[PDB]
Every structure is written in structure tokens, then in C-alpha cells.
């Protein structure tokens, strides 16, 4: 009755936005960036190797001053390293050993971690007692949570695997806004440089651009064919690059509302686990399941070098805020610094 | 050429590394077991009769078993965390004939998973007493749900427990063959399946898991010594 008319209206609206995206595409990124000179070979070598963990490393995050980093492993430990001298600043033992995410606050005060226990634990590092004490535990999610990202010292955005994201206020504990609209497990997110709107990628082969202040989903991007399990913003906040399980990354643009470029090679068959840009926005780095990272020249899409050296799967990767290192952490209990 | 505070910071890092190596010595000797099963299978009554995590001991060996079941029916994505566990304890409610084919499909999905290409399955065909009652009562057939049962007869290489009817033994070994067909038809050599029949009021399960983890670690050591 009315449901068929509703489905027909949804189909005609999807056809309207498809024709509107088609009308606004006159050329492509490869037809504008054909005349510029390419990057050339990139040889980045391992400077530091940080060996303290007992099991697989699942996520890491650089501190905002580009020196300290936190890394969470499956044996139930966060370790905070000073990466210039490879010292262990802190070793925090967790309540539950299954941790899938990690975050460093942009003040240096807090560290958040969560995992298969549905609970975002927020730890307070600068106490008057010298030890690292659990400041609080946020619990309102219905599934495992995969990524946590700090806005400032008072509010945190969490994406869980029950098709939802949430904006928590740490001072009280209740979530203030719930972002729904996905139809699969949200696997990663990344915030804009202005932290007024963020983007999140799920297992339904779509990424969605959410407004933090209002609370509504703004745009959806469907280009992939499998689960998106890594996402990161381009540094001016007008593009983002997604990594999936069908062995291809791609770069979507927010204002043009569609996909611009696809990074893939026929000798690559395994899925992407981590994606982050560089400080210019010209090196789309990627961590793969075949134990090595690849550096893609992100304007002409040709590859430009690899970063091999891991024995097992690269599960996390990050570029410092001054752009002077790349830390890749993998399932053989090692973090490695490259520049 | 380090300063004074830098030397004290290196001393703090060394004390942290000492504590981490003590925790490694504790962590290497423990055995993780991922528990899985259906809703009516009673995995929780196995765990409570011997809550995600649960630690127990057999003969000063520490088993550490966790039932991740607080999420929904899509187990496809969090199962990558459990690719270094010692075994997977799968539990089947072997007395409900209507919900048994779903259990077989779930076991086929666990066996042929690409992250579990090395992990062995200890398979507990739970609730044997209700199966015995349903076979000896004769109200609900098994041939209505499995048409091959009309041409299955007990093989000579089996040892029935004393005190039970041969029809009960035929039904028991039919269920066991239906799971070991999915076991043997893939992954021959890397991992195997150890089926046990288990009651609800039975209490010898920690010994069975102990013997099976003994065999699993023995086979892993015969593989990793270039010895097989």
C-alpha cells in the first residue's frame, strides 16, 4: 500500500542524487594532476623499535606534541612510550584484556581505551599520587566499540559495533548525542581539524559525514564493495581516504560529494587495516594484511614505495602532528618508527 | 652523556620492564579457550557447574575461558581477536531436532573461517539425557529432519557405554558423524575436532578439556619443531 510508494520515493530520490553527482563530474583528479612532476622513490628506514608488549598490538595514537605515544595490546596493557629515547613512561594494566582501540587526549592528560567489554575506560595520567588511576568508565553502548577520539578534556566520540556512534560528556557520564543511520558495524572514525564534524566508516560499504554540533547525518559515500575498516581526513578537512577489505583505498571529496580516485594494484589482494595521510596530503600511507605498508602518491595515484619489516599483520599506523615520523604497530608485538 | 633526570628516567623504564617480564612468565603458561554455542545449548551451565571471563585450574594449570556473547548475531568481525587462542569449545544442544541444522551450519561457518585456520575445536554434544528420553520414548523421529537416517546403521568400530539401548547409540553416533563430516572434509592436518558426549549433571568436563589441550599443544609442538 503506502510502503511501496515509500520505497519508490526512496528509489527516485537515490536516482536524483545519482544524476546530480553525475552532472557535477566533468573531469577527474588524474586528468588534472597529469602534468605535475611525480614524487619518485621513497626510502624510509626503521629508526626506533619499541619492544615491550606480550601480544598483538591493536591501536596506537601519537600525543599532540609529537613525542609521546600510547599503544594498547591484547594482553591487557596500555604502554606510554617516549619515542625519542624509547623509554616507557607508563604501563597501565587494564580491567579486561580485550582492547580494540586507543586514544591520547590533545592535552596530554587523559588516555582512553575500550574493546569487547562495551566500556570506554578513561584514565587520568597526571594525578597527585603518582599512579595511573581509572578516572571513569563510560557504558551505554550495546556492542563492542572500535574507535575512540578525544575532542578536548571533557567530551569523547565513540563508535561501537552496534551500528551507532555517540558523543560522551565525561564529567557526568551520560551520552549527549547518539548518531544512528548505519546498517553495519562501525569500524573506525576520524575527526576534522576544526572538530566541528567527523566521518565514520562501517561494514555496510559506506562512510557517513556527521555534524557533531547539530546531530544529523549530512552525507553518505558509497564506493566500496566490502567492509571499511580504516578512515582518515585529508588535512584541510575537505577530503578523506577510506581503506577496505577489497584491497583498495579511495579518496572521496566532501564538496564535490563523490569519489575522486582509487588506489589499487593488481598484485595486491589483501585488505587495508590502517590509513593516514601526511602533513601535506601527498602521501596516502596504508597498512596491509601482507605485513607491509605502502606509500601512495595521493595526487597521481601511482605507488611510490613500501615500508616492509613487520613479521605479522600491520594493525595500526599514525603520522605525528609535525609530520616527522610514521609509527606502524603490528601483530608481532612491535611498534616501529620510520621517517 | 645523559643528565641526572635522564638516568633516573632510564632506571624507571628498567623497573617497568622487570615487571613486564614477570607478567610474561605468568602469561605464557596460561591457556585461553573461546567458548561458543547456541542459546539453548547451556554453555553457561557448563561454566557455572565447573559473565565473560572465567578462570579455573586443573593440576596446577590455569585455564582462562571467555564467553563473548554480549553482542548480536553477527560474529563475523570480532572473531579476529581470537586467532591465538588454544581451543574453541563449541557446545551443541543435541536434543532439539528442530534447531540442530542451524547448529550444523554454525559449525561449518566456524570450521572454515579464514582467521581460525589453526584453532582446534573441542565439541560438546550437551544434554544427552533428553536425547536418550526422546529416542526411547519414540514420539519425535529423527528421519523427518534427516533423511539419511533411514539408511544409517551402527558401525562395528564403536564402543557403546553399558546400560543403554542400541537405538540411542545409533542416534548418538549419527549426530557425532554429522559433525565430524564437517570436521574432516576441510583443513586436514592443521586442526582437528574432539567430540565428547556430555550430560547436564556431569562434572568431569575439566579433565576432558585438560586431555584435549594436552593433545593440542602436543600437536603444535610436533609441528613447530620441524618434527612431524
Amino acid at each position, epitope marked *: 500500500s503506502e510502503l511501496d510508494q515509500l520505497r519508490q520515493e526512496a528509489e527516485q530520490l537515490k536516482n536524483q542524487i545519482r544524476d546530480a553527482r553525475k552532472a557535477c563530474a566533468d573531469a577527474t583528479l588524474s586528468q588534472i594532476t597529469n602534468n605535475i612532476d611525480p614524487v619518485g622513490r621513497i626510502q624510509m628506514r626503521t629508526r626506533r623499535t619499541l619492544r615491550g608488549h606480550l601480544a598483538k598490538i591493536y591501536a596506537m595514537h601519537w600525543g599532540t606534541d609529537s613525542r609521546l605515544l600510547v599503544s594498547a595490546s591484547q594482553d591487557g596493557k596500555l604502554i606510554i612510550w617516549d619515542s625519542y629515547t624509547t623509554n616507557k*613512561v607508563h604501563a597501565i594494566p587494564l580491567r579486561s584484556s580485550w582492547v580494540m582501540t586507543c586514544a591520547y587526549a590533545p592535552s596530554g592528560n587523559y588516555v582512553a581505551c575500550g574493546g569487547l567489554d562495551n566500556i570506554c575506560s578513561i584514565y587520568n595520567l597526571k594525578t597527585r*599520587e*603518582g*599512579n595511573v588511576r581509572v578516572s571513569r568508565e563510560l557504558a551505554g553502548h550495546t556492542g563492542y566499540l572500535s574507535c575512540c577520539r578525544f575532542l578536548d578534556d571533557n567530551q569523547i566520540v565513540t563508535s561501537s559495533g552496534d551500528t551507532t556512534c555517540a558523543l560522551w560528556d565525561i564529567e557526568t557520564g551520560q551520552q549527549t548525542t547518539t548518531f544512528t543511520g548505519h546498517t553495519g558495524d562501525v569500524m573506525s572514525l576520524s575527526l576534522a581539524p576544526d572538530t566541528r564534524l567527523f566521518v565514520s566508516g562501517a561494514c555496510d560499504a559506506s562512510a557517513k559525514l556527521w555534524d557533531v554540533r547539530e546531530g544529523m547525518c549530512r552525507q553518505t559515500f558509497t564506493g566500496h564493495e566490502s567492509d571499511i575498516n580504516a578512515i582518515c581526513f585529508f588535512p584541510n578537512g575537505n577530503a578523506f581516504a577510506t581503506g577496505s577489505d577489497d584491497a583498495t583505498c579511495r579518496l572521496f571529496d566532501l564538496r564535490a560529494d563523490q569519489e575522486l580516485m582509487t588506489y589499487s594494484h593488481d598484485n595486491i589482494i589483501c585488505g587495508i587495516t590502517s590509513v593516514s595521510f601526511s602533513k601535506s596530503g601527498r602521501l596516502l600511507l596504508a597498512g596491509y594484511d601482507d605485513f607491509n605498508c605502502n606509500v601512495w602518491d595521493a595526487l597521481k595515484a601511482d605507488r611510490a614505495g613500501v615500508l616492509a619489516g613487520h613479521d605479522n599483520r600491520v594493525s595500526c599506523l599514525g603520522v605525528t602532528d609535525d609530520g616527522m615520523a610514521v609509527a606502524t604497530g603490528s601483530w608481532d608485538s612491535f611498534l616501529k618508527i620510520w621517517n | 652523556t645523559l643528565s*641526572a633526570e635522564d638516568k*633516573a*628516567a632510564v*632506571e624507571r623504564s628498567k623497573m617497568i620492564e622487570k615487571q613486564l617480564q614477570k607478567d610474561k612468565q605468568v602469561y605464557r603458561r596460561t591457556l585461553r579457550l573461546l567458548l561458543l554455542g547456541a542459546d539453548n545449548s547451556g554453555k553457561s551451565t557448563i561454566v557455572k557447574q565447573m559473565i565473560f571471563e572465567t578462570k579455573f585450574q586443573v593440576d596446577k594449570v590455569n585455564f582462562h575461558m571467555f564467553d563473548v556473547g554480549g553482542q548480536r548475531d553477527e560474529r563475523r568481525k570480532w572473531i579476529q581477536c581470537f586467532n591465538d587462542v588454544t581451543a574453541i569449545i563449541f557446545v551443541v544442544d543435541s536434543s532439539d531436532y528442530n534447531r540442530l541444522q542451524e547448529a550444523l551450519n554454525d559449525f561449518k561457518s566456524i570450521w572454515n573461517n579464514r582467521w581460525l585456520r589453526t584453532i582446534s575445536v573441542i565439541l560438546f554434544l550437551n544434554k544427552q539425557d533428553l536425547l536418550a528420553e526422546k529416542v526411547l520414548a519414540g514420539k519425535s523421529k529423527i528421519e523427518d529432519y534427516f533423511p539419511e537416517f533411514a539408511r544409517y546403521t551402527t558401525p562395528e568400530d564403536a564402543t557403546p557405554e553399558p546400560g543403554e539401548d542400541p537405538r540411542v547409540t545409533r542416534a548418538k553416533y549419527f549426530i557425532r558423524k554429522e559433525f565430524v563430516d564437517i570436521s574432516t572434509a576441510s583443513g586436514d592436518g592443521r586442526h582437528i575436532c574432539y567430540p565428547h558426549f556430555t550430560c547436564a549433571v556431569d562434572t568431569e568436563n575439566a579433565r576432558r578439556i585438560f586431555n584435549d589441550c594436552k593433545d593440542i599443544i602436543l600437536q603444535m609442538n610436533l609441528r613447530e619443531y620441524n618434527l612431524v
Partner: single-chain antibody
Amino acid sequence: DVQLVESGGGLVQPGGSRKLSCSASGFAFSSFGMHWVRQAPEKGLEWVAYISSGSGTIYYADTVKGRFTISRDDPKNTLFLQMTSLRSEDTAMYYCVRSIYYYGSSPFDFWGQGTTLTVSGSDIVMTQATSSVPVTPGESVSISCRSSKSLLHSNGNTYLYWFLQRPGQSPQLLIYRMSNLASGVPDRFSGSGSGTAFTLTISRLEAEDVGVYYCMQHLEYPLTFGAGTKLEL
């Protein structure tokens, strides 16, 4: 709450022996390096002992090396100084000072309350050429502390600390590493300088800022204090 309290003072005739005990309440004592710092009845501060975390490193001063012995009991939460062969130049008031060392930490942050003990060279001479400045409430004051060796290490840190001791209380960490304020200090205290010249500046000086201001170095042991500048109103 966080506190350290010490006891074991009182009259000792020379050549004798005495043990001082500092019990800690309210912090993780097993992870804090602990210092002992003494003060003469009219002079300024000087350093006497240091024991690390896990007791793997002990340092003494050049005056008391061999006749003082420091140790710690981590399960019972105590710090001991056993003093033998006392001279008449050990009559002092002894303070038990916690300090934690990692990247970005705040050493010397909490000082004890001190016991009164009555008894009947290629180190850095931190000179503090001013000794008493008459101040009015609500005015900017600057206090200068010149080192002899350059305190700027090669990794950029300038290990110089500024302490405040009020009349009748225990000293308090104002500034650590020449610029960073300590946690709990008003934002009107600020430190400046380079290499061998340092300065503290106070804007809108209140009535609760009178006292004596000490500058400690921390580049290499023995940590030598300054003579202290009094702020008489």
C-alpha cells in the same frame, strides 16, 4: 590526603647515633625517589641523601659520606636515615622530600615537616647576590640566581628549580626547570633566563608571598642550593 611525616629528633651528644623515620600516607610510595634535605638553625638548605625507586641507586653528600646510611621499607611505607659519628655541625632540621622522574614529571614537589635534631670542590656554586628586598603589596619583584657552571643541557632542558619557604612552614616547589610552573601555583609566578643567568618575577605580590626563595640546580649531584633571598614587607 598526601602527606609525609618524620620523627626521631631531639638531643644527641656528639659521637652518638640516631635514626630518623619518615612515614608516607596517601601516595604510591613504591614508585617515588626519596631525598633527604637538611636545614641549619639559621643558614639555608643543603642536600644530605638520596635513594631511588627500588633502592637501586643511592647518593650522598660530600659532608656525610660514610657516616650516614639511608634506606627504605616499601611494604611498611617508611624512609630511614641512620646517622652515626655525629659532629656538632649536624644540628639541623631534616626534611623528607619526594621526587618522581619521568618525561615531563615534577620532581621535589612535596616536602615533609622536618625533625629538629639538636647536637650539643668541582660542584656548582649557585650564588644569589641579593639577600633582602623590602617589598610592598601589589608590585612586580624579580629575584636573580646566577650559576657558575652552565645548566643548559644538550637536550634543551635547563635544570633549575625555584622553591619558596614561608616563615614557619616547609618549602614548596614554585617552578621546575626554569619555566614550568608547579601544579597548584598561582599564575603570577614566572621564571626566565638562560644558561647561567636566571630570574623569577612576581606580579601583584600578595601578603602570602613573603618568605625566602631558594634556587636549586639539578644537573648533577650533589644538588647545591642557593643562600635564599628574604622578602621582608
